[PDB]
Ligand SMILES: *[C@@H]1O[C@H](CO)[C@@H](O[C@@H]2O[C@H](CO)[C@@H](O)[C@H](O)[C@H]2NC(C)=O)[C@H](O)[C@H]1NC(C)=O
């Protein structure tokens with residue numbers, strides 16, 4: 001649930017926006033994020 | 049995001065068809081009411097986790113029929129109509145890579161894999177066509193090169209870079225997605241976190257089952 | 265208008281809280297969980313745990329210590345298991361409440377004490393302010409958020425080509441209503457004539473795809489002629 | 491309840507007592523596996539597939555932009571323990 | 572409790588007024604219809620025949 005709150009924050013700040021938190025969404029200056037449904041989880045393609 | 053939405057009842061697990069065991073468990077009080085309540089709370093928590101993660105979008109969005117995104121390829125991440133389930137090729141391989149009846153019942157997730165894929169596709173379509181605006185109110189269509197230029201502007205790199213290098217950045221992003229495809233398909237340790245979660249849950253359930261084979 | 269909208273929003277919050285019993289759902293659920301845990305812990309005192317009776321005073325008045333101690337030990341083991349379970353549940357729930365409290369502290373820190381650019385962190389929309397409101401065993405935030413309402417569809421181009429040199433918008437979006445091209449801030453339709461002040465030149469025209477021919481106003485010549 | 495009373499079958503299980511509805515409604519009582527039940531009109535419980543939302547086809551184009559002309563300063567109440 | 576599922580819900584929640592939702596009141600168990608016993612052919616058959 002901590003990881004799920006982290007994932008919800010990650011979509012909220014990177015899929016639904018652009019996050020300036022360094023190294024929060026991928027190593028580098030973060031650009032986008034594409035959610036990808038995975039079995040019992042989620043996968044982010046952090047375009048950085 | 050969501051562990052296996054399981055639920056376990058004492059009255060079948062600890063005691064089989066036998067009633068004497070049920071009577072003796074009754075004198076123990078409400079341990080099992082507590083356990084069922086805790087596991088039901090965990091299950092509802094899993095459903096709430098899935099809804100909080102994926103359902104940030106209120107209106108399910110549909111990708112445009114024509115993918116004229118200025119050069120970017122999202123065929124790997126967008127749903128594939130050819131497959132019966134509208135899951136992306138990357139999502140398809142992710143599902144492929146990831147791999148007990150004693151009162152242990154696995155409650156189905158409230159959001160089925162198809163609707164979770166629908167949430168994911170809605171989020172993808174909103175990101176592609178609208179960007180950040182769909183998460184802050186109405187979805188506002190914007191060409192993908194324009195919103196990528198805005199992401200550059202967000203990270204302190206002027207819009208010069210993208211519009212001058214649209215084709216190059218397009219190809220770099222495309223090859224990056226292709227390399228994600230290849231590194232996921234070839235390397236089996238890519239989905240380590242999900243595989244570990246599934247393995248941990250499965251071995252916890254297996255240990256619980258084998259505990260019925262312990263003399264104590 | 266914005267003051268009136270803010271006041272009406274607060275009034276609607278008041279009315280919604282009054283009308284909807286489940287408005288304070290999170291706090292009521294926390295209180296109910298704690299009360300259920302305490303009630304279950306109390307009820308376990310009524311459970312035999314295999315002992316002859318669930319009240320210590322009766323067995324202590326009924327059985328001499330040699331054989332009383334086995335029943336008291338049954339009750340001790342049962343009540344200690346129940347108390348250990350209750351304390352473990354309270355520790356996990358208190359970890360959850362501490363995560364919630366760190367979340368509340370962070371929300372206060374860059375929403376009440378600042379403006380958070382984290383999207384959807386403090387209210388659905390571009391967060392403006394947050395007003396803490398003490399509530400029983402918790403906190404309530406009134407996340408004043410800017411949510412745009414009435415969108416208008418326009419024709420856009422990545423750039424503007426004047427004199428063969430691409431002009432990008434310094435801050436905003438290039439839009440047009442048809443035969444008239446305007447630069448507009450991203451989150452509110454305020455069309456402005458294109459000027460070198462809000463457009464910075466960048467490279468040559470042919471490099472970018474989607475560029476459109478147009479004119480960009482430059483303020484110097486009206487002064488030069490006069 | 492006795493069997494045969496508006497029996498409807500889904501992946502979650504055999505739902506008895508509520509008639510299936512082809513129309514999609516917002517989830518009120520989550521049955522599981524995508525089925526949600528609500529009390530709607532004379533009055534009976536209806537089990538339906540989830541409506542994730544109104545399917546909005548964003549009119550994307552390589553030259554289409556939407557810029558809002560008005561806002562709503564909406565106070566959102568977030569309750570935190 | 573046994574009258575209808577609503578009363579089973581009241582007994583489970585221990586409240587006469589139950590809020591809208593889904594409550595795991597009990598578990599459905601299919602009883603065995605009959606008993607079958609199977610054993611091999613009688614190897615040491617007494618030669619009564
Ligand atoms: C923008 O929206 C606001 C409200 O969201 C509009 O204000 C309304 O205006 C009408 C007529 O002018 C009044 O009858 C309403 O009482 C107003 N509502 C509120 C809450 O004040 C406003 O007209 C819209 N347009 C502009 C240009 O501001």
Ligand SMILES: *[C@@H]1O[C@H](CO)[C@@H](O)[C@H](O)[C@H]1NC(C)=O
Pocket residue numbers: 115120121122123124222
């Ligand atoms: C983009 O996706 C694939 C990936 O390379 C590419 O081969 C395809 O031609 C592109 N799609 C379209 C519609 O051009």
Ligand SMILES: *[C@@H]1O[C@H](CO)[C@@H](O)[C@H](O)[C@H]1NC(C)=O
Pocket residue numbers: 416417418549554
């Ligand atoms: C949205 O943009 C399209 C452009 O094809 C236009 O026809 C339509 O009228 C716009 N929507 C509104 C509400 O004006």
Ligand SMILES: *[C@@H]1O[C@H](CO)[C@@H](O)[C@H](O)[C@H]1NC(C)=O
Pocket residue numbers: 441442443444
């Ligand atoms: C577009 O904006 C210009 C700006 O003055 C205005 O004159 C014109 O009437 C508007 N509408 C059209 C269709 O050009």
Ligand SMILES: *[C@@H]1O[C@H](CO)[C@@H](O)[C@H](O)[C@H]1NC(C)=O
Pocket residue numbers: 114116473474475552553
């Ligand atoms: C936009 O796409 C259409 C076809 O989808 C094409 O004819 C047109 O040239 C494109 N224009 C720009 C600016 O990309």
Ligand SMILES: *[C@@H]1O[C@H](CO)[C@@H](O)[C@H](O)[C@H]1NC(C)=O
Pocket residue numbers: 475476477
């Ligand atoms: C702008 O004008 C030049 C002048 O020759 C022309 O070649 C070019 O095609 C024009 N641009 C557009 C987008 O029509």
Ligand SMILES: *[C@@H]1O[C@H](CO)[C@@H](O)[C@H](O)[C@H]1NC(C)=O
Pocket residue numbers: 510511512
């Ligand atoms: C739903 O559609 C199916 C399609 O065959 C039909 O058989 C069924 O009667 C419909 N149900 C209702 C309630 O309309």
Ligand SMILES: *[C@@H]1O[C@H](CO)[C@@H](O)[C@H](O)[C@H]1NC(C)=O
Pocket residue numbers: 619620
């Ligand atoms: C009669 O004889 C046969 C021999 O073929 C034997 O198998 C059978 O058991 C005999 N019947 C009885 C009642 O013993």
